[PDB]
């Protein structure tokens, strides 16, 4: 759409008010021209045909409940774009300012969110297991990072490589949640999962086993569902990433925490320079150690901690 850039205001899934970047051409659209080649949000109108209609509103106010998931998908995608640019100097997902697109209101009672190879897609949840998925900044950032990974390392979605792909999306989703300072934690999806129960989440990075996911290589799932356990075995890498950041003693192995910034710099470097489509856990460890080496020196404490953390989770 060609028009005039403006700013509208509305309310997100959790009922918080925010300003969002819109475009005006007869209607006001959810089109943000301030970021790269644009962020565009579409209505899939409960259907599965994509992308759907670019979102149009008559008065630049988005307070209807039907509007909530679109406000958030649009705003959170902006924040996520900002994180990548400000922290890692990367322009959008392909590093060349590609337009970021999302569709909300996909299907009926859809309890998931995903990246379809070209755009993000968000279900509204059935209202018991989930509420509209774009209300979780860690979820939106998990989705856009799959795009980042696909354009860089290209980790195949299965077995070990696939679990690394999933963990990268949880790690960066989590780093974005802290960047935005939105009540941050080391849990995934807490804000949109089981509105009826407080205190739970889909997965935990600080203690994966809390929901039955492995937290040590010896406990890796070796079966075939979930493409070989991509959302299960990610627990082992997420625990490693949590220890490199925060520190702790896990299975008798102590790790000194180096903090979140460094965690983010080391994994982004591993992802963008060293990993490949078929990389396995062991190769991820070599990548992470080399990245930390590049950045802080071989005899650094940073290198030391990346090593300790992998040892703690059993990855050699
Ligand atoms: C078993 C399975 C398969 C696929 C999934 C997911 C699980 C997982 C389902 C949710 C836990 C309910 N999806 C994800 O973890 C994320 C969404 C979270 C809310 C962050 N979606 P993905 O982008 O990983 C898409 C896949 C596809 C297949 O989700
Ligand atoms: Ca309106
Ligand atoms: Ca949180
Ligand atoms: Ca979280
Ligand atoms: Ca809950
Ligand atoms: Zn994922």
mmCIF file of C-alpha atoms and ligand atoms in Angstrom:
data_model
loop_
_atom_site.group_PDB
_atom_site.id
_atom_site.type_symbol
_atom_site.label_atom_id
_atom_site.label_comp_id
_atom_site.label_asym_id
_atom_site.label_seq_id
_atom_site.Cartn_x
_atom_site.Cartn_y
_atom_site.Cartn_z
ATOM 1 C CA UNK A 1 0.000 0.000 0.000
ATOM 2 C CA UNK A 2 1.334 3.504 -0.842
ATOM 3 C CA UNK A 3 0.297 6.104 1.665
ATOM 4 C CA UNK A 4 1.232 8.299 4.616
ATOM 5 C CA UNK A 5 2.986 6.933 7.688
ATOM 6 C CA UNK A 6 1.119 7.489 11.036
ATOM 7 C CA UNK A 7 0.745 6.136 14.445
ATOM 8 C CA UNK A 8 -2.366 4.480 15.854
ATOM 9 C CA UNK A 9 -3.059 3.096 19.315
ATOM 10 C CA UNK A 10 -4.778 -0.016 20.504
ATOM 11 C CA UNK A 11 -4.916 -2.788 23.064
ATOM 12 C CA UNK A 12 -3.142 -6.096 22.950
ATOM 13 C CA UNK A 13 -4.181 -9.581 23.952
ATOM 14 C CA UNK A 14 -3.289 -9.037 27.597
ATOM 15 C CA UNK A 15 -5.259 -5.746 27.626
ATOM 16 C CA UNK A 16 -2.240 -3.411 27.604
ATOM 17 C CA UNK A 17 -2.421 -0.287 25.484
ATOM 18 C CA UNK A 18 0.269 0.424 22.913
ATOM 19 C CA UNK A 19 0.991 2.701 19.919
ATOM 20 C CA UNK A 20 1.581 0.936 16.619
ATOM 21 C CA UNK A 21 2.954 2.228 13.266
ATOM 22 C CA UNK A 22 0.217 2.323 10.595
ATOM 23 C CA UNK A 23 -0.157 3.572 7.055
ATOM 24 C CA UNK A 24 -2.970 5.785 5.854
ATOM 25 C CA UNK A 25 -4.548 5.502 2.382
ATOM 26 C CA UNK A 26 -8.330 5.823 2.668
ATOM 27 C CA UNK A 27 -8.198 3.252 5.479
ATOM 28 C CA UNK A 28 -5.517 2.915 8.090
ATOM 29 C CA UNK A 29 -3.461 -0.233 7.564
ATOM 30 C CA UNK A 30 -1.237 -2.330 9.772
ATOM 31 C CA UNK A 31 1.775 -1.474 7.654
ATOM 32 C CA UNK A 32 4.846 -0.072 9.458
ATOM 33 C CA UNK A 33 7.099 1.763 7.054
ATOM 34 C CA UNK A 34 9.694 2.590 9.664
ATOM 35 C CA UNK A 35 11.385 -0.728 9.705
ATOM 36 C CA UNK A 36 13.334 -1.965 6.716
ATOM 37 C CA UNK A 37 11.074 -2.756 3.787
ATOM 38 C CA UNK A 38 8.097 -2.826 6.162
ATOM 39 C CA UNK A 39 6.186 -4.927 8.679
ATOM 40 C CA UNK A 40 2.721 -6.011 7.438
ATOM 41 C CA UNK A 41 -0.007 -7.683 9.428
ATOM 42 C CA UNK A 42 -2.929 -9.545 7.796
ATOM 43 C CA UNK A 43 -6.248 -10.978 8.822
ATOM 44 C CA UNK A 44 -6.692 -14.676 7.878
ATOM 45 C CA UNK A 45 -10.418 -14.384 9.028
ATOM 46 C CA UNK A 46 -10.459 -17.831 10.602
ATOM 47 C CA UNK A 47 -9.430 -19.492 7.450
ATOM 48 C CA UNK A 48 -6.192 -21.312 6.421
ATOM 49 C CA UNK A 49 -5.655 -19.508 3.113
ATOM 50 C CA UNK A 50 -2.614 -17.243 3.418
ATOM 51 C CA UNK A 51 -1.766 -14.476 3.873
ATOM 52 C CA UNK A 52 -5.203 -13.215 3.977
ATOM 53 C CA UNK A 53 -6.164 -9.331 3.726
ATOM 54 C CA UNK A 54 -3.702 -6.617 4.797
ATOM 55 C CA UNK A 55 -5.269 -5.370 8.006
ATOM 56 C CA UNK A 56 -7.473 -2.254 7.392
ATOM 57 C CA UNK A 57 -9.148 -0.131 10.033
ATOM 58 C CA UNK A 58 -11.339 2.855 9.672
ATOM 59 C CA UNK A 59 -10.111 5.115 12.384
ATOM 60 C CA UNK A 60 -6.623 4.193 13.512
ATOM 61 C CA UNK A 61 -7.940 2.933 16.891
ATOM 62 C CA UNK A 62 -7.614 -0.764 17.642
ATOM 63 C CA UNK A 63 -9.611 -1.482 20.737
ATOM 64 C CA UNK A 64 -12.039 -4.214 19.517
ATOM 65 C CA UNK A 65 -11.312 -7.654 20.775
ATOM 66 C CA UNK A 66 -10.967 -8.949 17.283
ATOM 67 C CA UNK A 67 -8.161 -6.407 16.883
ATOM 68 C CA UNK A 68 -5.980 -7.584 19.833
ATOM 69 C CA UNK A 69 -3.937 -10.359 18.217
ATOM 70 C CA UNK A 70 -3.160 -8.114 15.294
ATOM 71 C CA UNK A 71 -1.929 -5.245 17.499
ATOM 72 C CA UNK A 72 0.397 -7.552 19.241
ATOM 73 C CA UNK A 73 1.719 -9.463 16.257
ATOM 74 C CA UNK A 74 2.395 -6.089 14.593
ATOM 75 C CA UNK A 75 4.052 -4.457 17.613
ATOM 76 C CA UNK A 76 6.086 -7.491 18.708
ATOM 77 C CA UNK A 77 7.424 -8.046 15.243
ATOM 78 C CA UNK A 78 8.682 -4.389 15.439
ATOM 79 C CA UNK A 79 10.429 -5.014 18.729
ATOM 80 C CA UNK A 80 11.978 -8.166 17.452
ATOM 81 C CA UNK A 81 13.235 -6.362 14.326
ATOM 82 C CA UNK A 82 14.667 -3.754 16.669
ATOM 83 C CA UNK A 83 16.452 -6.276 18.810
ATOM 84 C CA UNK A 84 18.215 -7.856 15.817
ATOM 85 C CA UNK A 85 19.181 -4.545 14.402
ATOM 86 C CA UNK A 86 20.293 -2.828 17.595
ATOM 87 C CA UNK A 87 22.010 -5.731 19.228
ATOM 88 C CA UNK A 88 23.415 -7.792 16.358
ATOM 89 C CA UNK A 89 23.363 -5.298 13.565
ATOM 90 C CA UNK A 90 21.245 -7.550 11.395
ATOM 91 C CA UNK A 91 18.622 -5.917 9.043
ATOM 92 C CA UNK A 92 15.572 -8.113 9.226
ATOM 93 C CA UNK A 93 15.628 -11.848 8.856
ATOM 94 C CA UNK A 94 17.608 -12.115 5.631
ATOM 95 C CA UNK A 95 20.014 -9.414 6.640
ATOM 96 C CA UNK A 96 18.841 -7.330 3.732
ATOM 97 C CA UNK A 97 15.738 -5.678 5.203
ATOM 98 C CA UNK A 98 13.184 -8.198 3.888
ATOM 99 C CA UNK A 99 9.441 -7.260 4.606
ATOM 100 C CA UNK A 100 8.176 -9.092 7.633
ATOM 101 C CA UNK A 101 4.667 -10.423 7.321
ATOM 102 C CA UNK A 102 2.277 -12.025 9.778
ATOM 103 C CA UNK A 103 -1.249 -13.330 9.659
ATOM 104 C CA UNK A 104 -3.504 -13.624 12.788
ATOM 105 C CA UNK A 105 -6.911 -15.217 13.241
ATOM 106 C CA UNK A 106 -5.641 -18.305 11.389
ATOM 107 C CA UNK A 107 -8.042 -21.168 11.423
ATOM 108 C CA UNK A 108 -10.444 -21.839 14.329
ATOM 109 C CA UNK A 109 -9.314 -22.810 17.748
ATOM 110 C CA UNK A 110 -5.734 -23.143 16.468
ATOM 111 C CA UNK A 111 -3.270 -23.801 19.262
ATOM 112 C CA UNK A 112 -0.042 -23.034 17.569
ATOM 113 C CA UNK A 113 2.099 -20.441 15.738
ATOM 114 C CA UNK A 114 4.602 -21.029 13.011
ATOM 115 C CA UNK A 115 6.845 -19.764 10.222
ATOM 116 C CA UNK A 116 5.689 -21.231 6.859
ATOM 117 C CA UNK A 117 8.853 -20.540 4.939
ATOM 118 C CA UNK A 118 7.656 -17.047 3.976
ATOM 119 C CA UNK A 119 5.726 -15.489 6.874
ATOM 120 C CA UNK A 120 4.543 -15.946 10.454
ATOM 121 C CA UNK A 121 1.148 -17.366 11.222
ATOM 122 C CA UNK A 122 -0.708 -17.146 14.606
ATOM 123 C CA UNK A 123 -3.653 -19.184 15.849
ATOM 124 C CA UNK A 124 -6.190 -17.646 18.340
ATOM 125 C CA UNK A 125 -5.879 -20.753 20.679
ATOM 126 C CA UNK A 126 -9.065 -22.578 21.763
ATOM 127 C CA UNK A 127 -9.241 -20.229 24.695
ATOM 128 C CA UNK A 128 -8.431 -22.906 27.322
ATOM 129 C CA UNK A 129 -5.101 -24.227 26.386
ATOM 130 C CA UNK A 130 -4.090 -20.899 24.817
ATOM 131 C CA UNK A 131 -5.175 -17.421 24.141
ATOM 132 C CA UNK A 132 -4.166 -15.798 20.842
ATOM 133 C CA UNK A 133 -0.559 -16.714 20.421
ATOM 134 C CA UNK A 134 0.841 -13.331 19.320
ATOM 135 C CA UNK A 135 0.194 -12.022 22.835
ATOM 136 C CA UNK A 136 3.592 -13.625 23.936
ATOM 137 C CA UNK A 137 6.643 -11.649 22.921
ATOM 138 C CA UNK A 138 8.806 -14.842 23.352
ATOM 139 C CA UNK A 139 6.439 -16.658 20.937
ATOM 140 C CA UNK A 140 6.637 -13.902 18.250
ATOM 141 C CA UNK A 141 10.393 -13.753 18.607
ATOM 142 C CA UNK A 142 10.588 -17.630 18.537
ATOM 143 C CA UNK A 143 8.771 -17.440 15.124
ATOM 144 C CA UNK A 144 10.896 -14.753 13.534
ATOM 145 C CA UNK A 145 14.080 -16.403 14.676
ATOM 146 C CA UNK A 146 13.086 -19.565 12.700
ATOM 147 C CA UNK A 147 13.278 -17.215 9.687
ATOM 148 C CA UNK A 148 16.706 -15.995 10.820
ATOM 149 C CA UNK A 149 17.950 -19.567 11.142
ATOM 150 C CA UNK A 150 16.534 -20.631 7.791
ATOM 151 C CA UNK A 151 18.413 -17.764 6.049
ATOM 152 C CA UNK A 152 21.688 -18.440 7.838
ATOM 153 C CA UNK A 153 22.719 -21.891 9.203
ATOM 154 C CA UNK A 154 19.601 -23.537 7.526
ATOM 155 C CA UNK A 155 19.431 -26.230 10.256
ATOM 156 C CA UNK A 156 17.233 -29.082 8.941
ATOM 157 C CA UNK A 157 14.096 -29.683 10.938
ATOM 158 C CA UNK A 158 14.791 -33.029 12.280
ATOM 159 C CA UNK A 159 16.800 -35.021 14.838
ATOM 160 C CA UNK A 160 19.695 -33.070 16.419
ATOM 161 C CA UNK A 161 19.858 -30.317 13.923
ATOM 162 C CA UNK A 162 16.158 -29.718 14.331
ATOM 163 C CA UNK A 163 16.439 -29.582 18.124
ATOM 164 C CA UNK A 164 19.208 -26.993 17.758
ATOM 165 C CA UNK A 165 16.898 -25.027 15.406
ATOM 166 C CA UNK A 166 14.136 -25.132 18.091
ATOM 167 C CA UNK A 167 16.507 -24.142 20.930
ATOM 168 C CA UNK A 168 17.886 -21.170 18.974
ATOM 169 C CA UNK A 169 14.309 -19.924 18.576
ATOM 170 C CA UNK A 170 13.610 -20.376 22.365
ATOM 171 C CA UNK A 171 16.920 -18.758 23.329
ATOM 172 C CA UNK A 172 16.475 -15.713 21.170
ATOM 173 C CA UNK A 173 12.807 -15.521 21.935
ATOM 174 C CA UNK A 174 13.902 -15.303 25.556
ATOM 175 C CA UNK A 175 16.622 -12.735 24.849
ATOM 176 C CA UNK A 176 14.001 -10.572 23.102
ATOM 177 C CA UNK A 177 11.696 -10.917 26.096
ATOM 178 C CA UNK A 178 14.512 -9.528 28.311
ATOM 179 C CA UNK A 179 15.358 -6.836 25.785
ATOM 180 C CA UNK A 180 11.876 -5.535 25.891
ATOM 181 C CA UNK A 181 11.844 -5.899 29.612
ATOM 182 C CA UNK A 182 8.309 -7.315 29.466
ATOM 183 C CA UNK A 183 8.323 -9.253 32.863
ATOM 184 C CA UNK A 184 11.151 -11.506 31.558
ATOM 185 C CA UNK A 185 11.909 -15.094 32.645
ATOM 186 C CA UNK A 186 13.482 -18.265 31.313
ATOM 187 C CA UNK A 187 10.139 -19.892 30.521
ATOM 188 C CA UNK A 188 8.526 -20.118 27.064
ATOM 189 C CA UNK A 189 4.958 -18.975 26.335
ATOM 190 C CA UNK A 190 3.909 -18.264 29.832
ATOM 191 C CA UNK A 191 1.824 -15.265 28.861
ATOM 192 C CA UNK A 192 -0.582 -17.083 26.492
ATOM 193 C CA UNK A 193 -0.651 -20.594 27.819
ATOM 194 C CA UNK A 194 -3.585 -21.918 30.089
ATOM 195 C CA UNK A 195 -5.123 -18.620 31.063
ATOM 196 C CA UNK A 196 -6.791 -20.655 33.769
ATOM 197 C CA UNK A 197 -3.564 -21.699 35.490
ATOM 198 C CA UNK A 198 -0.992 -19.343 36.759
ATOM 199 C CA UNK A 199 2.678 -20.095 36.948
ATOM 200 C CA UNK A 200 2.955 -22.647 34.186
ATOM 201 C CA UNK A 201 4.553 -22.383 30.691
ATOM 202 C CA UNK A 202 5.090 -24.574 27.631
ATOM 203 C CA UNK A 203 8.744 -25.265 28.250
ATOM 204 C CA UNK A 204 11.315 -24.166 30.783
ATOM 205 C CA UNK A 205 14.911 -23.272 29.914
ATOM 206 C CA UNK A 206 16.007 -23.087 33.598
ATOM 207 C CA UNK A 207 14.543 -26.498 34.333
ATOM 208 C CA UNK A 208 13.407 -28.345 31.388
ATOM 209 C CA UNK A 209 12.583 -31.477 33.342
ATOM 210 C CA UNK A 210 9.800 -29.591 35.050
ATOM 211 C CA UNK A 211 7.637 -30.530 32.083
ATOM 212 C CA UNK A 212 9.396 -33.775 31.287
ATOM 213 C CA UNK A 213 11.886 -32.525 28.737
ATOM 214 C CA UNK A 214 15.520 -33.802 28.958
ATOM 215 C CA UNK A 215 18.183 -31.779 30.681
ATOM 216 C CA UNK A 216 21.084 -34.031 29.964
ATOM 217 C CA UNK A 217 22.212 -35.889 26.781
ATOM 218 C CA UNK A 218 21.788 -39.214 28.445
ATOM 219 C CA UNK A 219 18.104 -38.516 28.582
ATOM 220 C CA UNK A 220 17.621 -37.556 24.864
ATOM 221 C CA UNK A 221 14.553 -38.891 23.106
ATOM 222 C CA UNK A 222 15.509 -41.225 20.323
ATOM 223 C CA UNK A 223 12.112 -41.983 18.814
ATOM 224 C CA UNK A 224 10.346 -40.671 15.754
ATOM 225 C CA UNK A 225 7.679 -38.457 16.807
ATOM 226 C CA UNK A 226 8.072 -34.644 16.610
ATOM 227 C CA UNK A 227 10.535 -35.134 13.776
ATOM 228 C CA UNK A 228 12.813 -37.012 16.113
ATOM 229 C CA UNK A 229 11.999 -34.809 19.220
ATOM 230 C CA UNK A 230 12.874 -31.396 17.987
ATOM 231 C CA UNK A 231 10.738 -29.732 20.636
ATOM 232 C CA UNK A 232 11.927 -32.266 23.244
ATOM 233 C CA UNK A 233 15.711 -32.514 22.861
ATOM 234 C CA UNK A 234 15.859 -28.744 22.553
ATOM 235 C CA UNK A 235 15.634 -28.920 26.337
ATOM 236 C CA UNK A 236 19.286 -30.032 26.501
ATOM 237 C CA UNK A 237 20.557 -27.005 24.561
ATOM 238 C CA UNK A 238 18.207 -24.621 26.363
ATOM 239 C CA UNK A 239 19.582 -25.821 29.682
ATOM 240 C CA UNK A 240 23.082 -25.272 28.432
ATOM 241 C CA UNK A 241 22.287 -21.789 27.280
ATOM 242 C CA UNK A 242 20.610 -21.036 30.628
ATOM 243 C CA UNK A 243 23.725 -22.195 32.494
ATOM 244 C CA UNK A 244 26.165 -20.198 30.343
ATOM 245 C CA UNK A 245 24.127 -17.137 31.150
ATOM 246 C CA UNK A 246 23.127 -17.609 34.762
ATOM 247 C CA UNK A 247 25.520 -20.133 36.171
ATOM 248 C CA UNK A 248 24.857 -23.080 38.456
ATOM 249 C CA UNK A 249 25.839 -26.613 39.299
ATOM 250 C CA UNK A 250 23.989 -29.211 37.255
ATOM 251 C CA UNK A 251 24.706 -32.910 37.634
ATOM 252 C CA UNK A 252 27.729 -32.059 39.791
ATOM 253 C CA UNK A 253 29.305 -29.709 37.168
ATOM 254 C CA UNK A 254 29.611 -26.037 38.142
ATOM 255 C CA UNK A 255 29.414 -23.243 35.623
ATOM 256 C CA UNK A 256 30.132 -19.668 36.157
ATOM 257 C CA UNK A 257 27.434 -17.421 34.622
ATOM 258 C CA UNK A 258 28.686 -14.892 31.950
ATOM 259 C CA UNK A 259 25.433 -13.087 31.506
ATOM 260 C CA UNK A 260 22.826 -12.737 28.794
ATOM 261 C CA UNK A 261 24.570 -10.319 26.484
ATOM 262 C CA UNK A 262 27.510 -12.488 26.025
ATOM 263 C CA UNK A 263 25.228 -15.586 25.691
ATOM 264 C CA UNK A 264 23.461 -13.742 22.781
ATOM 265 C CA UNK A 265 26.732 -12.635 21.158
ATOM 266 C CA UNK A 266 28.204 -16.122 21.262
ATOM 267 C CA UNK A 267 25.143 -17.968 19.927
ATOM 268 C CA UNK A 268 24.462 -15.398 17.151
ATOM 269 C CA UNK A 269 28.015 -15.773 16.028
ATOM 270 C CA UNK A 270 27.806 -19.634 16.140
ATOM 271 C CA UNK A 271 24.554 -19.441 14.120
ATOM 272 C CA UNK A 272 25.735 -17.048 11.515
ATOM 273 C CA UNK A 273 29.231 -18.214 10.984
ATOM 274 C CA UNK A 274 29.758 -21.734 12.025
ATOM 275 C CA UNK A 275 26.700 -23.842 11.977
ATOM 276 C CA UNK A 276 25.471 -25.724 8.914
ATOM 277 C CA UNK A 277 22.233 -27.456 7.921
ATOM 278 C CA UNK A 278 23.259 -30.824 9.403
ATOM 279 C CA UNK A 279 25.111 -29.718 12.455
ATOM 280 C CA UNK A 280 24.604 -31.970 15.542
ATOM 281 C CA UNK A 281 24.978 -31.184 19.250
ATOM 282 C CA UNK A 282 28.588 -31.953 19.340
ATOM 283 C CA UNK A 283 29.190 -29.667 16.396
ATOM 284 C CA UNK A 284 27.157 -26.968 18.163
ATOM 285 C CA UNK A 285 29.504 -27.210 21.101
ATOM 286 C CA UNK A 286 32.614 -26.757 18.811
ATOM 287 C CA UNK A 287 30.864 -23.819 17.203
ATOM 288 C CA UNK A 288 30.070 -22.154 20.473
ATOM 289 C CA UNK A 289 33.561 -22.636 21.833
ATOM 290 C CA UNK A 290 35.122 -21.246 18.657
ATOM 291 C CA UNK A 291 32.720 -18.255 18.637
ATOM 292 C CA UNK A 292 33.542 -17.457 22.321
ATOM 293 C CA UNK A 293 37.289 -17.844 21.347
ATOM 294 C CA UNK A 294 36.881 -15.419 18.496
ATOM 295 C CA UNK A 295 35.215 -12.982 20.736
ATOM 296 C CA UNK A 296 36.942 -13.177 24.113
ATOM 297 C CA UNK A 297 40.127 -15.126 23.716
ATOM 298 C CA UNK A 298 41.062 -18.762 24.278
ATOM 299 C CA UNK A 299 41.999 -18.306 27.772
ATOM 300 C CA UNK A 300 38.930 -16.435 28.570
ATOM 301 C CA UNK A 301 36.468 -17.217 31.335
ATOM 302 C CA UNK A 302 33.776 -16.975 28.613
ATOM 303 C CA UNK A 303 35.321 -19.873 26.782
ATOM 304 C CA UNK A 304 35.648 -21.707 30.065
ATOM 305 C CA UNK A 305 31.937 -21.342 30.863
ATOM 306 C CA UNK A 306 30.769 -22.395 27.425
ATOM 307 C CA UNK A 307 32.816 -25.570 27.935
ATOM 308 C CA UNK A 308 31.527 -26.225 31.507
ATOM 309 C CA UNK A 309 27.897 -25.792 30.413
ATOM 310 C CA UNK A 310 28.159 -28.268 27.607
ATOM 311 C CA UNK A 311 29.909 -30.709 29.891
ATOM 312 C CA UNK A 312 27.145 -30.246 32.444
ATOM 313 C CA UNK A 313 24.518 -31.352 29.900
ATOM 314 C CA UNK A 314 26.550 -34.170 28.695
ATOM 315 C CA UNK A 315 27.466 -32.870 25.247
ATOM 316 C CA UNK A 316 30.994 -33.547 24.218
HETATM 317 C C1 LIG B 1 5.030 -31.507 18.586
HETATM 318 C C2 LIG B 1 5.037 -30.218 17.998
HETATM 319 C C3 LIG B 1 5.087 -30.020 16.607
HETATM 320 C C4 LIG B 1 5.143 -28.715 15.935
HETATM 321 C C5 LIG B 1 5.118 -27.617 16.758
HETATM 322 C C6 LIG B 1 5.116 -27.753 18.146
HETATM 323 C C7 LIG B 1 5.087 -29.037 18.682
HETATM 324 C C8 LIG B 1 5.047 -26.770 19.333
HETATM 325 C C9 LIG B 1 3.547 -26.809 19.728
HETATM 326 C C10 LIG B 1 3.281 -25.790 20.834
HETATM 327 C C11 LIG B 1 4.176 -26.169 21.982
HETATM 328 C C12 LIG B 1 1.855 -25.880 21.327
HETATM 329 N N1 LIG B 1 5.298 -25.373 18.720
HETATM 330 C C13 LIG B 1 6.195 -24.519 19.224
HETATM 331 O O1 LIG B 1 6.917 -24.758 20.192
HETATM 332 C C14 LIG B 1 6.267 -23.174 18.514
HETATM 333 C C15 LIG B 1 5.228 -22.289 19.285
HETATM 334 C C16 LIG B 1 5.518 -22.034 20.786
HETATM 335 C C17 LIG B 1 4.256 -21.376 21.396
HETATM 336 C C18 LIG B 1 6.721 -21.116 20.906
HETATM 337 N N2 LIG B 1 5.872 -23.289 17.105
HETATM 338 P P1 LIG B 1 7.001 -23.722 15.931
HETATM 339 O O2 LIG B 1 7.387 -22.482 15.215
HETATM 340 O O3 LIG B 1 8.146 -24.445 16.631
HETATM 341 C C19 LIG B 1 5.991 -24.600 14.815
HETATM 342 C C20 LIG B 1 5.833 -26.078 15.166
HETATM 343 C C21 LIG B 1 5.438 -27.034 14.152
HETATM 344 C C22 LIG B 1 5.263 -28.420 14.538
HETATM 345 O O4 LIG B 1 5.216 -26.290 16.423
HETATM 346 CA CA1 LIG B 2 -10.832 0.907 14.691
HETATM 347 CA CA1 LIG B 3 7.629 -13.423 30.865
HETATM 348 CA CA1 LIG B 4 8.993 -16.171 28.617
HETATM 349 CA CA1 LIG B 5 -1.040 -20.510 32.429
HETATM 350 ZN ZN1 LIG B 6 9.810 -23.561 16.714
#
